């Protein structure tokens, strides 16, 4: 199948350079152009940068002078080479292929681009256990607060992804220059705490991969 | 540039009705060099009209693409809750290439009161000297919901930062998150911490609290 994997998001400083990349995957890389098209917080798709199968190179005016969009078929990879960033860049970026107009057909997961001269700070991950009420209903529902983070994005799974179903992340939120997000599940009252419910969370810029264990308090 | 314009943010349906989703374009594009795409939650956008009226392949003809030179719509016949989505148009006329801002597209559901649950701030937090308190209100329906914070019985509004989910596909509800976070400093000077909700569902505030004075 069609697969579009982008690369180098990440946190860089206003005044910075970054490249992103693109590997592509499952279509013949040459006969297709290639583009970039970011989503920013406030906005919907803003088309960045478009280059033909071959070579004729269309920008942007917001990034014209800063952005090089460039591709090297014999590894079917797609590049954006970014400098003078600035706050306003700061998007996901996704990496999209047409057909033979410009309508793209097939449209990358997408990487996260922060600018921004905060630091990269690991998140603090608490474990949010409820209080003897909220117990012993049907069902029953924990939390995992995760707090003061920089920059976005952070990834949550419960029990490693088994428990998916009932399960809510809610969107960060930017305060003091540091990023908060906070995750419930619901399980039956059956299963916690006569098992274990743990929340795992990845933050990939500051290497950081912890497993949180959610344990009932002690009377 | 063209300017490529969706007046509505949000358009709300039950299932089986027909929503017309509109585009303007500032300029003639003619034919088609105007395409429509879909972005469900979770997921980044596929192609779903071009040319203004050619479905995509594997996109069923209950959508319906329609209009040319500066006027469009996407009509969805029959809409199912599977088509809970963002929805942009985007002319490919000319350069630079440009996009509506997208129409939201919200599966009504039967009313459902939200499921409510607080929770103290952990040990670990308190070590550090943070107190965030949170409360999860889940599975509701409709999208509009006010929370307050009371500490022993005072309303308490600084130190409140809220976040909302987007409708969910699988069960057509919205959930929200409202953390207070104090200093331990100040959370250990109080015993009753209430999170009150006011929805459609709710006659007298949905109530969720705790006392410290207990496990």
């Known amino acids: 199948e069609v697969k579009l994997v982008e690369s180098g998001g990440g946190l860089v400083q206003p005044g910075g350079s970054r490249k992103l990349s693109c590997a592509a995957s499952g279509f013949t890389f040459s006969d297709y152009g290639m583009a970039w098209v970011r989503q920013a917080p406030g906005k919907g798709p803003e088309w960045i940068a478009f280059?033909?199968?071959?070579?004729?190179?269309y920008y942007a005016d917001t990034v014209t002078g800063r952005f090089t969009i460039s591709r090297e078929n014999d590894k079917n990879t797609l590049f954006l080479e970014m400098s003078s960033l600035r706050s306003e860049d700061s998007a996901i970026y996704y990496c999209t292929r047409d057909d033979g107009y410009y309508r793209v057909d097939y449209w990358g997961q997408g990487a996260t681009l922060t600018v921004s001269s905060a630091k990269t700070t690991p998140p603090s991950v608490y474990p949010l256990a409820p209080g003897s009420a909220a117990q012993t209903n049907s069902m029953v529902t924990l939390g995992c607060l995760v707090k003061g983070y920089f920059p976005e994005p952070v990834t949550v799974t419960w029990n490693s992804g088994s428990l998916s179903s009932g399960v809510h992340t809610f969107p960060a939120v930017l305060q003091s220059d540091l990023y908060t997000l906070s995750s419930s599940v619901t399980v039956p009252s059956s299963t916690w705490p006569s098992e274990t419910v743990t929340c795992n969370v990845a933050h990939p810029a500051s290497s950081t991969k912890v497993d949180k264990k959610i344990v009932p308090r002690d009377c | 540039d063209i300017v490529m314009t969706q007046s509505h943010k949000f358009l709300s349906t039950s299932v089986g009705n027909r929503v017309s989703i509109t585009c303007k374009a500032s300029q003639d594009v003619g034919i088609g060099l105007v395409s429509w795409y879909q972005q469900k939650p979770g997921q980044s956008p596929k192609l779903l009209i071009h040319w203004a009226s050619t479905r995509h392949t594997g996109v069923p003809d209950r959508f319906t693409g329609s209009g040319s030179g500066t006027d469009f719509t996407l009509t969805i016949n029959n809409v199912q809750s599977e088509d809970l989505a963002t929805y942009f148009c985007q002319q490919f006329s000319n350069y630079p290439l440009t996009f509506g801002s997208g129409t939201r597209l919200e599966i009504k559901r039967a009313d459902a009161a939200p499921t409510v649950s607080i929770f103290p701030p952990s040990s670990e937090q308190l070590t550090s000297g943070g107190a965030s308190v949170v409360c999860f209100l889940n599975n509701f329906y409709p999208k509009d919901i006010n929370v307050k914070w009371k500490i022993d019985g005072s309303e308490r509004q600084n130190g409140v930062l809220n976040s909302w989910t987007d409708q969910d596909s699988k069960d057509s509800t919205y959930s929200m998150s409202s953390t207070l976070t104090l200093t331990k400093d100040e959370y250990e000077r109080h015993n009753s911490y209430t999170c009150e909700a006011t929805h459609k569902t709710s006659t007298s505030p949905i109530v969720k609290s705790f006392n410290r004075d207990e496990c």
């Open positions: 280059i033909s199968n071959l070579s004729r190179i």
